[PDB]
Structure formats: C-alpha cells, structure tokens
Amino acid sequence: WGNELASAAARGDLEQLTSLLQNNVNVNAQNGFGRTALQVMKLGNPEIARRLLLRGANPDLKDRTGFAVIHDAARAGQLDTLQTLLEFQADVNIEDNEGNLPLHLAAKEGHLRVVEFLVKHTASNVGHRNHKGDTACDLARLYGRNEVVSLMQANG
C-alpha cells in the first residue's frame, strides 16, 4: 500500500491512487526510499494532492534536502497543487536548508503567478532573508526575473 500508493502518486495515476485509497492505508507511509506519496506526487496533479490531504497526509514533511512538497510546487510553478496544499494548512513559510521560502523558489524561477498568489493571498514573509541574506525579490533580481521584481515591489 505505502509503496504502491507512492507509485500511483508519482506517476500521476489518479485512478490507481483512488483504488488504493479504498484500502485501509496510511497515506503518510514512506516508500522504499523514505518519501511519502504526497512528497513524490507528480506535480500538475492537484487532485492527487487533494485526495492524499483529505486522508490526513502531512504536507510539511521534508526530504533528503529539507524540501517540502510546497517548495517543489513553487519551484515548478505548479500553482494548482500549491493552492490545494495551502487549503489543507500547509506552512507557506516552511524553509529549505538554505533559509529559502517557497516564495524565494518561485521568484528565483520567474513564476510570476505563483509569486503573485503568494504575495497577495498568503502569509508568506516577503521580507524573509535566506541564510546568505537574500530576500525572494533579491533572488528574482539576481536571476533577471524583471517582471517578478516589478510585481513584488509593487505590493510589498
């Protein structure tokens, strides 16, 4: 179950996931390499996250590199999944090993809509400096994400 469930999530197979969820499974069980279904979930499949979260999946877990799924969602610009993550109390201000918030990652990557949502509709700490002293806007600036920079200084 734990292995198969993670597999279904990772492959983005909603049909298979829901079938597995008919069993008495622990959605927070880890697979062969210590990751939960939610953590390995193929991004871009918000319903997969929803169904796991509805069953009690812990959204704040971190992997080998101290990254939570919301970090991955923000870095990949996967808004839908990021939003469903938050509607289930995921911590918007969770930090990676370098002090980065999901905001920093979305900003660094230039995902304007993810940043906009985070800045305008979440408790994201816009002024948060990572361990090297850089804010999300600083990183957007460093990576030449001009529109993200404009948007961020426009509202924060």
UniProtKB/Swiss-Prot annotation:
InterPro entries: Ank_Repeat/CDKN_Inhibitor, Ankyrin_rpt, Ankyrin_rpt-contain_sf. It comes from the Eukaryota. GO terms for cellular component: cytoplasm; cytosol; nucleus. ANK repeats lie at residues 1-29, 33-61, 65-94, 98-128. The keyword Repeat applies. The keyword Metal-binding does not apply. Signal peptide: none annotated. Highest levels found in skeletal muscle. Also found in pancreas and heart. Keywords: ANK repeat, Cell cycle, Repeat. Coiled coil: none annotated. PANTHER family: ANK_REP_REGION DOMAIN-CONTAINING PROTEIN (PTHR24201), CYCLIN-DEPENDENT KINASE 4 INHIBITOR C (PTHR24201:SF9). Interacts strongly with CDK6, weakly with CDK4. Inhibits cell growth and proliferation with a correlated dependence on endogenous retinoblastoma protein RB. Belongs to the CDKN2 cyclin-dependent kinase inhibitor family. Heterodimer of p18 with CDK6. This is Cyclin-dependent kinase 4 inhibitor C.
